[PDB]
UniProtKB/Swiss-Prot annotation, chain A:
Family: Belongs to the universal ribosomal protein uL30 family.
Assembly behavior: Component of the large ribosomal subunit (LSU). Mature yeast ribosomes consist of a small (40S) and a large (60S) subunit. The 40S small subunit contains 1 molecule of ribosomal RNA (18S rRNA) and 33 different proteins (encoded by 57 genes). The large 60S subunit contains 3 rRNA molecules (25S, 5.8S and 5S rRNA) and 46 different proteins (encoded by 81 genes).
GO molecular function: RNA binding; structural constituent of ribosome
Gene that this polypeptide is encoded by: RPL7A
Family matches, as Gene3D superfamilies: Ribosomal protein L30, ferredoxin-like fold domain
Name of the molecule in the record: Large ribosomal subunit protein uL30A
Species per Swiss-Prot/TrEMBL record: Saccharomyces cerevisiae (strain ATCC 204508 / S288c)
The entry's keywords: Cytoplasm, Ribonucleoprotein, Ribosomal protein
One Pfam family from the record: Ribosomal_L30_N
Protein origin, superkingdom: Eukaryota
Assigned GO CC terms: cytoplasm; cytosol; cytosolic large ribosomal subunit
From Swiss-Prot, chain D:
Stated role: Component of the ribosome, a large ribonucleoprotein complex responsible for the synthesis of proteins in the cell. The small ribosomal subunit (SSU) binds messenger RNAs (mRNAs) and translates the encoded message by selecting cognate aminoacyl-transfer RNA (tRNA) molecules. The large subunit (LSU) contains the ribosomal catalytic site termed the peptidyl transferase center (PTC), which catalyzes the formation of peptide bonds, thereby polymerizing the amino acids delivered by tRNAs into a polypeptide chain.
GO cellular component, one term: cytosol
Protein name in the entry: Large ribosomal subunit protein eL18A
Organism: Saccharomyces cerevisiae (strain ATCC 204508 / S288c)
InterPro entries the record matches: Ribosomal_eL18, Ribosomal_eL18/eL18-A/B/_CS, Ribosomal_uL15/eL18, Ribosomal_uL15/eL18_sf
The family this protein is said to belong to: Belongs to the eukaryotic ribosomal protein eL18 family.
Annotated compartments: Cytoplasm
Subunit and interaction comment: Component of the large ribosomal subunit (LSU). Mature yeast ribosomes consist of a small (40S) and a large (60S) subunit. The 40S small subunit contains 1 molecule of ribosomal RNA (18S rRNA) and 33 different proteins (encoded by 57 genes). The large 60S subunit contains 3 rRNA molecules (25S, 5.8S and 5S rRNA) and 46 different proteins (encoded by 81 genes). eL18 interacts with NAP1.
PANTHER family, A to Z: 60S RIBOSOMAL PROTEIN L18, LARGE RIBOSOMAL SUBUNIT PROTEIN EL18
UniProtKB/Swiss-Prot annotation, chain E:
Quaternary organization: Component of the large ribosomal subunit (LSU). Mature yeast ribosomes consist of a small (40S) and a large (60S) subunit. The 40S small subunit contains 1 molecule of ribosomal RNA (18S rRNA) and 33 different proteins (encoded by 57 genes). The large 60S subunit contains 3 rRNA molecules (25S, 5.8S and 5S rRNA) and 46 different proteins (encoded by 81 genes).
Upper taxonomic lineage: Eukaryota, Fungi, Dikarya, Ascomycota, Saccharomycotina
Function: Component of the ribosome, a large ribonucleoprotein complex responsible for the synthesis of proteins in the cell. The small ribosomal subunit (SSU) binds messenger RNAs (mRNAs) and translates the encoded message by selecting cognate aminoacyl-transfer RNA (tRNA) molecules. The large subunit (LSU) contains the ribosomal catalytic site termed the peptidyl transferase center (PTC), which catalyzes the formation of peptide bonds, thereby polymerizing the amino acids delivered by tRNAs into a polypeptide chain.
One GO biological process term: cytoplasmic translation
Keyword vocabulary terms for this entry: Cytoplasm, Isopeptide bond, Ribonucleoprotein, Ribosomal protein, Ubl conjugation
GO molecular function, one term: structural constituent of ribosome
GO cellular component: cytoplasm; cytosol; cytosolic large ribosomal subunit; nucleus
Originating species: Saccharomyces cerevisiae (strain ATCC 204508 / S288c)
Name used for this protein in its record: Large ribosomal subunit protein uL15
Swiss-Prot record, chain F:
Organism domain of life: Eukaryota
Gene for this chain: RPL21A
The protein's name: Large ribosomal subunit protein eL21A
More info: There are 2 genes for eL21 in yeast.
Subunit structure comment from the entry: Component of the large ribosomal subunit (LSU). Mature yeast ribosomes consist of a small (40S) and a large (60S) subunit. The 40S small subunit contains 1 molecule of ribosomal RNA (18S rRNA) and 33 different proteins (encoded by 57 genes). The large 60S subunit contains 3 rRNA molecules (25S, 5.8S and 5S rRNA) and 46 different proteins (encoded by 81 genes).
Native source species: Saccharomyces cerevisiae (strain ATCC 204508 / S288c) (Baker's yeast)
Stated family: Belongs to the eukaryotic ribosomal protein eL21 family.
Function according to Swiss-Prot or TrEMBL: Component of the ribosome, a large ribonucleoprotein complex responsible for the synthesis of proteins in the cell. The small ribosomal subunit (SSU) binds messenger RNAs (mRNAs) and translates the encoded message by selecting cognate aminoacyl-transfer RNA (tRNA) molecules. The large subunit (LSU) contains the ribosomal catalytic site termed the peptidyl transferase center (PTC), which catalyzes the formation of peptide bonds, thereby polymerizing the amino acids delivered by tRNAs into a polypeptide chain.
Length: 222, 51, 155, 185, 148, 53
RNA sequence: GAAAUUGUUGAAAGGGAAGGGCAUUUGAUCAGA
RNA sequence: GGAAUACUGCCAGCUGGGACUGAGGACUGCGACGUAAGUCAAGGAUGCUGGCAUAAUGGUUAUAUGCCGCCCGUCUUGAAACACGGACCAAGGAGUCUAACGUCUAUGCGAGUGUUUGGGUGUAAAACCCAUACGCGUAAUGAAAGUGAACGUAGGUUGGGGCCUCGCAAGAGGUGCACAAUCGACCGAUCCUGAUGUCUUCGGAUGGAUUUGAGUAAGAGCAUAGCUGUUGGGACCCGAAAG
RNA sequence: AAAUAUGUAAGAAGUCCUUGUUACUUAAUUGAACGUGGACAUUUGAAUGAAGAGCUUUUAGUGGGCCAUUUUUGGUAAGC
């Protein structure tokens, strides 16, 4: 006649089972990432040995950071930044690369710095500044239960499942990315590396496609 | 009441991601790649050094 | 009435504190602080005195002796952040300091403290005497001279 | 700075409490606030919302309207719920026996219901009998039959009842109302 | 009361809610219905079409008592019977001893036929009747007796 | 597209389980191996300025 | 028996106005515990 | 040929120094370590120690110092302006009341509503009570004579909250008030059609229409009060030259 | 004959199938429109977003503007 101990034990057991599932899935993710990376490296080496060139697949994911303030923005780029949820300077989002979104990045190029995020960048972004949109509220991702309660219907049970769905642009990338609240990054800790931010990265500025240097920039801003 | 950052606070790092213990124990962040000895083709090298 | 007293009053029940998760773990003092090390006192009435480090006490203070016979600094506590640990060491093997603790210094001069000073100083000076000019070094006060740059000086 | 996509500090635009200072209405609101919070009954939620409505948003419901609602198939034994006033209607001669729960009953409406053999109950009695709104039929009076409504949207070719104090010949019927005088509407 | 008006709130605000550019001047558009045809034409034609001009024929010394003729629809036709007698007249819907309703005494001039009455004979005395009102009364088994 | 989607759904429900009925935007290109057999890269340089007028 | 304005006394400052904001020094003064 | 190193990137590698913060206030959660007891850096600071115990901290004030700081009000695209008013101070000083109204809201009653013209009464301008009328509403439409609102479960369709039935649930079905769109039906006007009958010129049945109404289609109104808005009034306050 | 700008569409109010009404239409159940009945929910049919969507009433002020980049007219030009 206590109805407490046999329920706390059941809850601890269910928690242990969910943790074992997360552990197995994260080990599988580590194996997946390692295999894919080594396979790309070996493909490049094999093409070079065969006298060919391995043209890597075009990047499926970009990270976009709004580097311009909110004043004096023309209406079409303003609407595109709103639709990408970059409504504040140093707010960043993940974008799945298609023609439909590349034509958006083209329109907002002078106001954003974007590139191809690495696994390390995504991991640190989600771990430090990962917030979920739950009931229209910004809730920090401090526990895997939050992620399971809001994304479990898509098979995403943990923060590493979320990161996997982000880095590999999975079937539920749209849902996971939208669940992620736009990342509120700081200014870069070592500065922007250039005297003037608002020319293209190619022209010695900060905006546009900086494809792999987005990782350095975002790690400084994170 | 207070957001504790993983990538610090190892306790929170382990609360999320139970695999972090295995990762650290097996040093998967410093994994040695298997040595391979494929050589680039002569056409690749000639094209690379071509003026 | 002058104020029309409030309908409800704040409760005069001081709530209990919630359980603090701060355990007291032992201090990790810097590696330059090894018993027998000559320390330079940076503050207090004995600021500038070079003393000998001894047992590390439970309240994180450092037990030091001048020795009193050498420079007039008795057996006393100092804060580890107010000393400069030189690279000059005497051997404390032979000094018995198990007696000195916090309650030893917890609040004219006690004859017991005078006697303990003599006992510790005897072995300390015996050890000091086998290093030339160490006694005079410990007698002299430390002071920064013109041009001294502590960020480059080695102690 | 933030580029806001919506107005900041925008009130919901819905009443969260009755404007009325009626203590009994506030007691009914407290009861149904508890019920709507702790029952998950859509009936309780809609009754709570209806308890906030202004007078024009609670048009009276006649006993003839109630009787037509009971003539609905399968609804003859349901308790009729009107969050507002139930008025009498002599144009109907056969009122059925039924339970009606309402904020207010006109003397004539209560007389007709009791005479037909039913009962008139308050909303708290309704809550005790049917805490989850079981077997209820919520009726609402005609909102857009108000006299004020027919003047809304006045304009050319709208047919919307000019705001006028005296009516008849010589009162806004000549130029702009017939082709023989300038034009029509 | 004055303490609830917005003029208390405008104290300290120079223009009193009337604007700095366009002030509260005396009669900027004219007085009353001025300019209904010239500079208030839009507000007249919208919201008051038909305002200007003449629309019919005059009637010198018109007396409204001549046209007094309040209308009662068949839908009620029974509120004129006292409530207690109404039940015993509705029951026993007899051709003999049918209730007599003096609608003129009740204050009506013409009986119209909007609603429908029960199948109970009623002797309806009226100055005027609608055609459909009379047919509905007869179908219920009553009669219309013209009075003056 | 509606006609083809009806046909594809019918064939899917007669064969197995896969639909993919929504259109998709142009996707990023997959990896490919470019051969140099008969296609050794030819080196170009920017041309000097001249007038040809 | 207010203010403007004024006398005396006391205190203080004062190289072509004065007044103000943030911060602290100095002088004076003062509540709380 | 075998290495190294640079460069770039990764580590859920280790670790030192510095600064700001310590919100919360029984427990509850997720975890870590431990076989387990339990412990922990795990849903927000504790432990130890010293001095002082008052002008010491702090407040106020004056001054000094660093940096900053144009004169308000007003009209204006634009005022510190070489635009206007203002030497100073006190007191006074400008959206009011009324008639009739729009929206909204509160209240009473509700197909009705309004006691207060007046009568009765009174502890006497109060309060309390009341007949007949009258106003508005319950019928519209037509210039008018005039006519005057159910084919039907007061209609069909689409949606529709809520309710009902089944279902663990998802959902499925039924019923669907308000409300929205749409097609109909009814009343009046207009234009046609023109039965029986006949004061043979009256009557106007029946059936229609790219026509029309501020209509009907199980009434919502009336009264009081409040803000806001409208019109006439001195009409927010002050101001002509004039008549 | 561009670039920019611009209309429409991207579904369940959909696609298809059987057959009822008419005074319209056809040589003609020919068709037209509206119906009755029937099959088709994981991606219900591109992307991204959505402090939600829809709806109504009522009122304030305003109805002198000016400036910058770019397009551009008059003018030699102008802080025109
Ligand atoms: K004006
Ligand atoms: Mg720096
Ligand atoms: Mg710069
Ligand atoms: Mg917080
Ligand atoms: Mg802000
Ligand atoms: Mg203002
Ligand atoms: Mg003014
Ligand atoms: Mg006096
Ligand atoms: Mg004075
Ligand atoms: Mg390196
Ligand atoms: Mg605290
Ligand atoms: Mg101080
Ligand atoms: Mg200055
Ligand atoms: Mg100014
Ligand atoms: Mg000037
Ligand atoms: Mg002037
Ligand atoms: Mg002057
Ligand atoms: Mg005054
Ligand atoms: Mg005058
Ligand atoms: Mg004159
Ligand atoms: Mg103007």
């Amino acid at each position: 006649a206590e109805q407490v101990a046999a329920e706390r034990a059941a809850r601890k057991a269910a928690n242990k089972e969910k943790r074992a599932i997360i552990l197995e899935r994260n080990a599988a993710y580590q194996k997946e990432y390692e295999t894919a990376e080594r396979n790309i490296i070996q493909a490049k080496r094999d093409a070079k040995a065969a006298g060919s060139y391995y043209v890597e697949a075009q990047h499926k994911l970009v990270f976009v950071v709004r580097i311009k303030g909110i004043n004096k923005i023309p209406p079409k780029p303003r609407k595109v930044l709103q639709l990408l949820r970059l409504t504040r300077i140093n707010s960043g989002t993940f974008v799945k690369v298609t023609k439909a979104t590349l034509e958006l990045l083209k329109l907002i190029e002078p106001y954003v710095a974007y590139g191809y995020p690495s696994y390390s960048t995504i991991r640190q972004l989600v771990y430090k500044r990962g917030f979920g949109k739950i009931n229209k509220q910004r809730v920090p991702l401090s526990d895997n239960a939050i992620i399971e309660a809001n994304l479990g219907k898509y098979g995403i049970l943990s923060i590493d499942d979320l990161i996997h769905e982000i880095i590999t642009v999975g079937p539920h990338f749209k849902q996971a990315n939208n669940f992620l609240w736009p990342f509120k990054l700081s200014n870069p800790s070592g500065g922007w590396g250039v005297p003037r931010k608002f020319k293209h990265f190619i022209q010695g500025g900060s905006f546009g496609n900086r494809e792999e240097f987005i990782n350095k920039l975002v790690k400084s801003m994170n | 009441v207070l957001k504790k950052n993983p990538l610090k606070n190892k306790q929170v790092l382990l609360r999320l991601n139970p695999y972090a213990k295995v990762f650290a124990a097996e040093k998967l962040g410093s994994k040695k790649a298997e040595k391979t000895g494929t050589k680039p083709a002569a056409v690749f090298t000639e094209t690379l050094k071509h003026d | 009435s002058a104020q029309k007293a409030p309908k409800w009053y704040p409760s005069e029940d001081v709530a209990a504190l919630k359980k603090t998760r701060k355990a007291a773990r032992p201090q990790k003092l810097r590696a330059s602080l090894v018993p027998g090390t000559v320390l330079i006192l940076l503050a207090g009435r004995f600021r500038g005195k070079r003393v000998v480090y001894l047992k590390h006490l439970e309240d994180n203070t450092l037990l030091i002796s001048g020795p009193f016979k050498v420079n007039g600094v008795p057996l006393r506590r100092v804060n580890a952040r107010y000393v400069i640990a030189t690279s000059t060491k005497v051997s404390v093997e032979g000094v018995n300091v198990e007696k000195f603790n916090v309650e030893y210094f917890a609040k004219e001069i006690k004859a017991e403290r005078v006697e303990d000073q003599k006992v510790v100083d005897k072995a300390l000076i015996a050890e000091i005497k086998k290093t030339p000019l160490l006694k005079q070094y410990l007698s002299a006060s430390f002071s920064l001279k013109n041009g001294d740059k502590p960020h480059m000086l080695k102690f | 700075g933030i580029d806001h996509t919506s107005k900041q500090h925008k009130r919901s635009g819905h009443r969260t409490a009755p404007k009325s200072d009626n203590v009994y209405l506030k007691l009914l609101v407290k009861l149904y606030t508890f019920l709507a919070r702790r029952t998950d009954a859509p009936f309780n939620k809609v009754v709570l919302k209806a308890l906030f409505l202004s007078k024009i948003n609670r048009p009276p419901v006649s006993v003839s309207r109630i009787a037509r609602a009971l003539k609905q198939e399968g609804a003859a034994n349901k308790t009729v719920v009107v969050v507002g006033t139930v008025t009498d209607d002599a144009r109907i001669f056969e009122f059925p026996k039924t339970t009606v729960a309402a904020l207010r009953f006109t003397a004539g409406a209560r007389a007709k219901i009791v005479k037909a053999g039913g009962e008139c109950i308050t909303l708290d009695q309704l809550a005790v009998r049917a805490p989850k709104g079981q077997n209820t039929l919520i009726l609402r009076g005609p909102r857009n039959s108000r006299e004020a409504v027919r003047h809304f949207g006045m304009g050319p070719h709208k047919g919307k009842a000019p705001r006028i104090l005296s009516t008849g010949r010589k009162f806004e019927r000549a130029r702009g109302r017939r082709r023989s005088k300038g034009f029509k509407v | 009361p004055s303490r609830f008006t917005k003029t208390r709130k405008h104290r300290g605000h120079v223009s009193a809610g009337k604007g700095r550019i366009g002030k509260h001047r005396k009669h900027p558009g004219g007085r009353g219905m001025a300019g209904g045809q010239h500079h208030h034409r839009i507000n007249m034609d919208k919201y008051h079409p038909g305002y200007f001009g003449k629309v019919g024929m005059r009637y010198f010394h018109k007396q409204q008592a001549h046209f007094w003729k309040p209308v009662l629809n068949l839908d009620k036709l029974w509120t004129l019977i006292p409530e207690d007698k109404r039940d015993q007249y509705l029951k026993s819907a007899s051709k003999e001893t049918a209730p007599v309703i003096d609608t003129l005494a009740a204050g009506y001039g013409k009986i119209l036929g909007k609603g429908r009455i029960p199948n109970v004979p009623v002797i309806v005395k009226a100055r005027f009747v609608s055609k459909l009102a009379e047919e509905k009364i007869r179908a219920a088994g009553g009669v219309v007796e013209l009075i003056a | 597209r509606v006609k083809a989607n009806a046909a594809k759904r019918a064939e899917a429900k007669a064969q197995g389980v896969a639909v993919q009925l929504k259109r998709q935007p142009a996707q990023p290109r997959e990896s490919r191996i470019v051969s140099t057999e008969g296609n050794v890269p030819q080196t170009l340089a920017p041309v000097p300025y001249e007038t040809f007028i």
